[PDB]
């Protein structure tokens, strides 16, 4: 169908780690689905010792919100760059065809907006990110990425074509940060975004992140802000990394069905311990919880997780199952 | 079935690179398979110039021994932490469901042991590793990991369901080491395990290993200690990396059938040159030897292999095959 | 069949990024396909500020030329090492079985040549590279690698066995370079190849490349030297990385069908945003162009691409398609 003649619908976005309400399988025909995002440059505290990032975001968050459509829909995004920002921006959708993903059609200076339409003709989770000419990696590593999820119109399927269904979706964006230090060994704090540029590029070129965080900060997905679920619930875990490889793992769980390359027309793999998200992509995993407790969800380079920040928690309610796992003898003195 | 009512069997473990005797396809029903491992902290010489590691091991070796069961069996491990060790330990089985892989149920101080049961309900090769709260990567990178192999009850299968069988299995654990240097440019030697901690964490955070070794040392799987096979023999090569990615390759061979993500319910890939083991996982490859000679088996980041240590040898006996490869003209002066 | 009795054919190689003329599906029976390559050591300018590399090449180029045969053919290579070179060399074909890929049969000192035959019995794209004992990574990272493509005799196929066909093939070799600096912070320029060795090995061991280039130089595949195509044309993009992982991406496009592990007997994946080439391998992607414009083809670690050099361009002629993508509103003042 010609998109100029199709019905339009508007979606209200929600902040990560939630995902806006949506259908999996649907009876709906194709639609032009309208979204708006507003760019916010801001200084953010990213660790427990007061380190700051001169950050750049879609809609005030790292990652930007997840956009959900169905295969055959059109995405119609209005991108707003308020006059309170200092830098130009744009958007590159890996789900889109042409014009550098849309970047060439969405160059907005402070004080400007633009509106882009494209056909979501391929199912999967896809990264979107900012990409302004001459300063592409800086904008990405400072926070400007998120996920577009294009569901098959009849929902997710296993390798045999059986239906898969989730009860809740969560979105995790992983950010390799390059925070400069000065000659006193302390991280630098900058008064403006532009002042941070040259020092940051030098750190970038070492390919060694200072921090690697989920969702904007060390510990972002812990404490009051842990993810939640119940025994018997099936969760979809969307994981994006716009710049650098990562290897997700659920401690005490599995990826029941995983699309590590993120593209739903391909059969998923089962029973994964650890999967692989290529830098520049988003992938997705399903898991049905079978045990209660506080799980960790992390990058299984354990230095990247525990030392640099790439780890969160999932607090799961319900009944413990001794068939799956039992403590036969608690820690006690070695028999003599 | 309820595991409390099932038959129990005990397995005697063997040191890497061998794997304890086991059946592939079996007529046996499900069993509770009992294993014991004893933790040993020890100083180890890891290279040819006398560099030492303040190491931590399951059963005295890097990697720990490979445990083999069949899908539907229960693993029942007694983990012993003798009073001669300095640190607490535990075990996280990626093949297990709940309680941080078993880590929350197996916290043993020096002088203690514990016994854990879990259902091996998913087929594949899975990492196990130590994971004590607050010092997880240190224990892993110091040597505390190995493999649990859960075979399908009817043995390994190709994508069409045809049986695959191996004559010999070998287990290779690859260890990214972070050995500190002092201001004189020499590697540090420490009198105790605890003394090595702070300096090691600083090296870890650079994400640059000093050494990357198979099976505990540069050259461990060479010389008298090379792997062996014969023309016509099919080998299973199990490869674990609990912390960091690697890319196995057999020089002059292939991966005939490879499960790089390590999970046997998924179809394998054929004819691989180089495969990929995600940090935090174990994978497996089958190869049938067709040529005699001394092969290398290595990580194909050739700096990681030849400069940092991630390489071994396979010495293969038998008859050379000129149909597969022939020297038509030996090195000689260029025709003039 | 016995290769000694088969017909012989000779192929004239062409320089990257082109690939010599060949058939996809063929009616031909198996042949011994004869090739010649001549090693050239040379100093090369690798960036826009005059940095030089003491380089080593097959046939004068980085990568070496792509060799194309069909499954069941024999490759018969004459490798020439002229007396004007300083170092010994050889070749390791990952497509070959035995004798360290052929390296043990092809050790040529300056002034020598050798001729190797092997059966191309496995379909796929495979790396070939130099590998002289005691200095393997140096020769690889200095430029000595390329691709052998072994096509199925009936051409490429999708997961259902439907024929896939390409109109043009391009070959991209990605090279992680380790150029030393002196105490003044400038890259070193060396009078001879041997003089560069010790300083380069020290840089290698840091695992941090100074540059990461396609086809021998920053910007090699840009400007006059961009790749070209037309709307409606299907291209095969062959990507080799003999030493280090990479993650190819087409900005504004996709991998329609991708063999990321590079082995054509395995089903490809569809709709990829970004794929993964393991260090020590070659992979391949098909794409049919649907939009005109100048695309980027790059490693999607965007620091590796935009800061270190791992990026090229594809200039595509034809008609813009507003159904796939349309600018609904050009950048303009934010409504008040
Ligand atoms: Cu931006
Ligand atoms: Cu991108
Ligand atoms: Cu431990
Ligand atoms: Cu783990
Ligand atoms: Cu060479
Ligand atoms: Cu190789």
- DSSP-derived secondary structure for B71-137: TT-EEEEEEEE-TT--S-B--EETTS-SGGGGGGG--B-TTEEEEEEEE--S-EEEEEE---TT-HH
Please tell me the number of Cα atoms within 13 Å of A208 on its side-chain side: 17
Residue A87 to residues A39, A101, B70, B78, B129, Cα–Cα distance (Å): 10, 20, 59, 60, 46
Q: How far is B259 from chain A (nearest CA, A)?
A: 11
Which residues have a Cβ under 8 Å from the Cβ of A50 and sit 6 or more positions away? none
Cβ-Cβ contacts under 8 Å, A324 against chain B: 96-98, 118-119, 121
- ∠ Cα A295 A300 A305 (to 5°): 75
Tokens of residue A278, six digits = 């290529």
Q: How far is A115 from chain C (nearest CA, A)?
A: 5
Cβ atoms of residues B216 and B240 within 8 Å? no
Tokens of residue B236, six digits = 């299973």
Chains in contact with A, where contact requires at least 3 CB pairs less than 8 Å apart: B, C
Chains in contact with B, where contact requires at least 3 CB pairs less than 8 Å apart: A, C
Residue B219 to residues B14, B211, B226, B302, B309, Cα–Cα distance (Å): 20, 12, 9, 15, 7
Q: How far is B3 from chain A (nearest CA, A)?
A: 7
| Active-site position among C129, C211, C239, C254 | C129
Q: How many CB pairs under 8 A join A and B?
A: 164
Please tell me the number of Cα atoms within 13 Å of C227 on its side-chain side: 28
| Active-site position among B47, B51, B62, B129 | B129
Q: Do C136 and B333 touch (CB under 8 A)?
A: no
Cβ atoms of residues B9 and A330 within 8 Å? no
Strands (E), chain A: 8-10, 32-45, 52-58, 67-70, 74-81, 92-93, 112-119, 124-129, 145-151, 168-177, 211-214, 227-230, 234-241, 248-250, 255-259, 269-272, 281-288, 293-299, 311-317, 325-333
- B40 labelled catalytic: no
Pairing of strands A8-10, A32-45: parallel
Backbone angles phi, psi at A10, to 5 degrees: -105, 135
Cβ atoms of residues B218 and B177 within 8 Å? no
CATH fold match for the domains A2-152 and A153-319: yes
Distance CA C97, CA A58 (A): 52
Cβ atoms of residues B96 and B71 within 8 Å? no
Experimental structure resolution, Å:
1.1
Q: Which of C129, C13, C118, C9 is nearest to C72 (CA)?
A: C118
Of residues B300, B325, B327, nearest to C280 (C-beta): B300
Supply the DSSP string of C49-117, one letter for each residue. Answer: T--EEEEEEETTBSSPPPEEEETT-EEEEEEEE-TT--S-B--EETTS-SGGGGGGG--B-TTEEEEEE
Question: Where chain B is broken, by preceding residue (C–N > 2.5 Å)?
Answer: none
Residue C179 to residues A220, C172, C189, C193, Cα–Cα distance (Å): 39, 21, 9, 12
Cβ atoms of residues A213 and A310 within 8 Å? yes
- ∠ Cα C127 B262 C245 (to 5°): 35
Q: Do B280 and A247 touch (CB under 8 A)?
A: yes
Sign of CA dihedral B213, B217, B218, B220: negative
The one-character DSSP state at A71 is: T
Which residues have a Cβ under 8 Å from the Cβ of A24 and sit 6 or more positions away? A151, A155, A156, A165, A166
Pairing of strands A74-81, A32-45: parallel
Distance CA C151, CA C264 (A): 8
Sign of CA dihedral A87, A88, A93, A94: negative
Q: Do C331 and A112 touch (CB under 8 A)?
A: yes
- B133 labelled catalytic: no
Domain with residues B2-152, CATH architecture: Sandwich (2.60)
- Domain ranges within chain A, ordered by starting residue: 2-152, 153-319
Tokens of residue A336, six digits = 């003599």
Which residues have a Cβ under 8 Å from the Cβ of A184 and sit 6 or more positions away? none
Distance CA A118, CA C37 (A): 47
Q: Which of B180, B111, B176, B174 is nearest to B146 (CA)?
A: B174
Cβ atoms of residues B204 and B178 within 8 Å? yes
Which residues have a Cβ under 8 Å from the Cβ of B36 and sit 6 or more positions away? B13, B77, B78, B80
Cβ atoms of residues B123 and A270 within 8 Å? no
Q: Do A331 and B106 touch (CB under 8 A)?
A: yes
Question: Where would I find the H helices in A170-322?
Answer: 197-205, 302
Distance CA B330, CA C107 (A): 9
Tokens of residue B25, six digits = 């396809």
Distance CA B172, CA B238 (A): 6
Q: Which of C158, C128, C125, C172 is nearest to C309 (CA)?
A: C172
CATH code for the domain defined by A153-319 = 2.60.40.420
- Please name the method used to determine this structure: X-ray
Burial class (CB in 10 A: 0-12, 13-18, 19+), A198: exposed
Of residues B251, B320, B332, nearest to C100 (C-beta): B251
């Amino acid at each position: 169908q010609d998109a100029d003649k199709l019905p339009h619908t508007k979606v209200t976005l929600v902040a990560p780690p939630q995902v806006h309400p949506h259908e999996q399988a649907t009876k709906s025909g194709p639609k032009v689905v309208e979204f708006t995002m507003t760019i916010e440059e801001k200084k953010m505290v990213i660790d427990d010792k007061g380190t700051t990032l001169q950050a750049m975001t879609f809609n005030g968050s790292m990652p930007g919100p997840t956009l959900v459509v169905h295969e055959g829909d059109y995405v119609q995004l209005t991108l707003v760059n308020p006059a309170t920002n200092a830098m130009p921006h744009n958007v590159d959708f890996h789900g889109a065809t042409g014009a550098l993903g849309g970047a060439k059609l969405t160059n907005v200076n402070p004080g400007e907006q633009a509106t882009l339409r494209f056909k979501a003709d391929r199912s999967g989770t896809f990264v979107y990110h900012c990409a302004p000419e001459g300063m592409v990696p800086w904008h990405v590593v400072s926070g400007m990425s998120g996920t577009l999820m294009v569901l098959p119109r009849d929902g997710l399927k296993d390798p045999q074509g059986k239906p898969l269904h989730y009860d809740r979706a969560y979105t995790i964006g992983e950010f390799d940060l390059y925070i400069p230090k000065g000659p006193d060994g302390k991280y630098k704090d900058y008064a403006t975004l532009a002042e941070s540029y040259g020092d940051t590029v030098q750190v970038m070129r070492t390919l060694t992140p200072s921090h690697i965080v989920f969702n904007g900060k060390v510990g972002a997905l812990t404490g009051a802000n842990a993810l939640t679920a119940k025994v018997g619930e099936t969760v979809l875990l969307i994981h994006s990394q716009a710049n650098r490889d990562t290897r997700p793992h659920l401690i005490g769980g599995h990826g029941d069905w995983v699309w590590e390359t993120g593209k739903f027309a391909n059969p998923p793999q089962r029973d994964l311990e650890t999967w692989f998200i290529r830098g520049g992509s988003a992938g997705a995993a399903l898991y049905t919880f079978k045990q209660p407790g506080v799980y960790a969800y992390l990058n299984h380079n354990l230095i990247e997780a525990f030392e640099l920040g790439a780890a969160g928690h999932i607090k799961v309610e319900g009944k413990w199952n001794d068939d799956l796992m039992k403590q036969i003898k608690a820690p006690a003195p070695i028999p003599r």
